[PDB]
């Protein structure tokens with residue numbers, strides 16, 4: 001299915017895996033929890049190279065990503081091009097990088113409009129729906145894992161922690177600021193993917209990172225209780241780096257996120273309902 005690269009090819013096309021940033025003149029575009037993403041050129045096509053605690057489960061996570069990517073092909077899913085059994089995964093380059101970096105206007109990029117943010121939220125929901133319809137749990141839904149293409153179309157990436165589908169594990173893994181309570185207790189369920197998406201919806205509305213050490217509150221999901229406790233409303237948190245936001249659409253998106261962030265897992269909506277509510281918001 002995929003093209004087995006060789007380490008030297010990637011070493012060549014990524015400039016000795018230059019850890020310098022793209023702006024200065026390097027090839028490093030970002031990092032995750034299990035590797036660093038480098039920019040490369042194969043044929044004449046631009047590619048992203050992910051060069052990946054426990055060495056054998058790193059290799060299982062390598063295999064899992066290929067395992068899931070071979071059976072998962074959707075408009076709102078990233079595309080894997082090849083691999084290299086240091087371990088490496090080659091993807092199609094996303095011209096607009098990550099939703100996290102664009103919400104931050106990293107490297108001087110212009111702020112996302114509310115119209116673009118709405119399309120991004122719908123696309124990411126369509127991707128999660130495709131995964132849940134194929135009985136897959138991502139286990140790391142976050143804005144740094146939602147990438148944006150040449151049309152700012154949302155694409156979910158990093159399927160290395162994905163699992164098939166309630167069960168429990170001994171290896172709790174994820175990004176704490178996005179995880180539902182049952183996921184932090186060790187449960188494995190698609191209902192945790194919904195909760196993480198709700199955090200993403202809050203980052204899209206507010207433009208704030210999920211966790212900031214030098215901020216009150218430090219956790220974004222805690223603004224739901226402040227609004228619920230009549231202290232604030234969603235309009236006190238709307239990203240001010242927008243000129244096309246209306247109160248109805250934003251309050252519509254907040255209601256979806258609030259439903260997704262229900263502390264009880266069985267009260268959250270399924271991803272299909274999330275798709276429905278996000279489409280009614282624009283139609």
Ligand SMILES: COC(=O)NC[C@H]1C[C@H](Nc2cc(-c3ccc4cc(C#N)cnn34)ncc2C(=O)NC[C@@H](F)C(C)(C)O)C1
Nearest residue numbers: 029030031032037048091092093094095096097098157158
């Ligand atoms: C694991 O770590 C992260 O995904 N960290 C998040 C980090 C890496 C991400 N940036 C990128 C990721 C990908 C990409 C394409 C497929 C895949 C697949 C995976 C996987 N799995 C990861 N990335 N990826 N293409 C391009 C970029 C990028 O910067 N373009 C420049 C652009 F932003 C701009 C505006 C011109 O500056 C931020």
